[PDB]
Structures are given as structure tokens and as C-alpha cells.
Design a protein around this ligand. Structure first.
Ligand SMILES: [Cl-]
Length: 292
């Protein structure tokens, strides 16, 4: 057994050179494999086929679900007898010992990784699978496409942007160092949540995100909002109570038609090359709609 030594979040991992059958425990890792022409044999898809973004889903074809990302089914992982497991360095610390009994396991950033960190995980996966050259070519293609979309997004970058999900009668905002915040910065946007602003709102942190009630949204008053929801729906009970609020109606982004509701699976959960390409493409389309 020859191996390839790579670094992951726990140190060195010796990956067998014959690794072909791979179980992945986050969506970004499934994108990484598909980009490299590898079909994972198992995926923690939360029991929802639609959670794997369409172009990735269709490329991979049939696979076996190993259950939720929160609590993967180790019986199902062990039954697959994989060559390699790719686990999330934040989600899967608890099961790491058990996973290592089953197969060589890489522990890589996804859930707690920003845009660049997710890219890096992709690079580690490419190296682990003796596909470094293929990964370089794919990433050069990706970067060229992202920059092409950047140039095609017509929005005025001086309109500061707030990316957020809906939570508890307000917005749970993704700050400038989040995956979404950093990606928007890559596209030349200015996050409304500057470092100073976020410092001044930190008593409202809930882990990685900032809870903003309508009072604090009104104070921030970002020129643009991107609200990520399941199925890109805007008629949930929570969001409707928010949209009915008097302070909401006075917001600069609301009055001026600069609030866009986008798909949470694509924008927040996927964290892949294909999904970030689709996020950028969507911004181009939105920016080209009848100005009105
Ligand atoms: Cl997620």
C-alpha cells in the first residue's frame, strides 16, 4: 500500500493511492469530487436528494445516502466499506475516532469555512486523489468564470449589501468573514457589516452570525439585501411578519426594490464550485432586470 501524505485539520493523513470509493459528509465535498470526475459512493444528504445542487447531482448519478450531516449513519458508512471518508472539521469531531476505524478519514473545512477555505478543501481533496493537475485546471476555469460574472454584474458596488437568513422576527446576518460575505467581497461588493459595524453589534452574535432586529436593521439601513430562504420562497410565516413591520417598510433597500430572495441551498449550504458559479450568474441576471 503506497500512500499520498496530505495535511488536513487534524495533521497528516496518509491516503491510499488506490482510493476510489469515497464517502462524503458535506455537500461541498460532493461538488469537489464531481469536479474531479469522481462519483462518491455515499453522501450525507440529509435524506433530501434535492439538497445536492442539480448539475452536481446529475453528474454523480446514483449514490447511497448515509443520513444527516449532523449525525451521519456510521452503520451505513461501514456497510459501504469505503476507501476514504471526507468529514467536516467542525461537524464531525465527535465521530472522528469511529470514522477512522472504518477507513482513512480526511477532516476538512466546509461548514465553518469561508469561500477561500472551501476552495482550499477542494485543493486538499484534489491532492489526496492524485488529481492535483486536474484540480489546478478546474480552479483556473472556475476563477475565470467568476471574474467574467463579476464584470457582468451591473449593480452599483457602492450600494452596501447585507446577506442574511430569516430568524426570530428579524434577520440572522452573515458577516463579512462568512462564506457568503467573503464571496460577495470577491465579486467587488461592500458588505454593510464592516468590521467596525460588527464590533458595535457583537452583543447580538449567535455563533458565526449576527441577529438583527428591525431596530438594528433600520440603524444599519443597507442599500441592498440578499435574503437566503429555503426554495427561494418569501411567504413563510416568519418572513411575512417581518415584511409587515413598520420599520421594515421604511428601509432603504425595501423602498428601492433592492431586496432579493435567493435559494438557501445554493447560496448557504452548497459551498461548491458549481454553486458559487450559480450565485454569481444569478446576480448577473438580477442586475440586468428592467431597471424600473
Ligand atoms: Cl450548511
Amino acid at each position: 500500500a503506497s500512500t499520498i501524505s496530505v495535511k488536513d485539520e487534524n495533521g497528516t493523513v496518509k491516503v491510499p493511492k488506490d482510493a476510489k470509493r469515497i464517502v462524503v459528509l458535506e455537500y461541498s465535498f460532493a461538488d469537489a469530487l464531481a469536479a474531479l470526475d469522481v462519483k462518491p459512493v455515499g453522501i450525507a444528504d440529509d435524506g433530501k436528494k434535492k439538497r445536492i445542487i442539480k448539475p452536481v447531482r446529475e453528474k454523480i448519478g446514483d449514490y447511497t445516502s448515509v443520513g444527516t450531516r449532523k449525525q451521519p449513519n456510521l452503520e451505513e458508512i461501514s456497510k459501504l466499506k469505503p476507501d476514504l471518508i471526507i468529514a467536516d472539521s467542525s461537524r464531525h469531531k465527535g465521530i472522528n475516532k469511529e470514522l477512522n476505524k472504518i477507513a482513512p478519514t480526511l477532516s476538512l473545512k466546509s461548514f465553518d469555512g469561508d469561500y477561500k477555505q472551501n476552495i482550499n478543501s477542494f485543493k486538499t481533496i484534489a491532492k489526496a486523489l492524485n488529481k492535483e493537475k486536474e484540480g489546478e485546471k478546474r480552479l483556473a476555469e472556475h476563477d475565470k468564470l467568476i471574474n467574467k460574472y463579476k464584470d457582468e454584474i451591473k449593480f452599483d458596488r457602492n450600494q452596501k449589501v447585507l446577506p442574511a437568513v430569516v430568524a426570530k422576527a428579524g434577520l440572522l446576518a452573515h458577516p463579512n468573514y462568512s462564506y457568503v460575505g467573503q464571496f460577495l467581497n470577491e465579486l467587488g461588493f461592500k458588505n454593510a457589516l464592516s468590521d467596525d459595524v460588527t464590533k458595535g453589534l457583537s452583543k447580538y452574535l449567535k455563533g458565526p452570525y449576527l441577529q438583527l432586529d428591525t431596530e438594528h436593521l433600520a440603524d444599519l439601513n443597507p442599500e441592498r439585501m440578499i435574503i437566503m430562504t429555503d426554495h427561494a420562497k418569501k411567504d413563510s410565516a416568519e418572513f411575512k411578519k417581518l415584511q409587515e413591520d413598520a420599520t421594515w417598510k421604511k428601509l432603504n433597500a425595501v423602498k428601492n426594490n433592492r431586496v432579493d430572495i435567493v435559494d438557501r441551498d445554493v447560496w448557504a449550504r452548497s459551498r461548491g464550485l458549481i454553486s458559487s458559479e450559480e450565485m454569481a450568474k444569478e446576480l448577473v441576471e438580477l442586475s440586468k432586470k428592467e431597471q424600473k
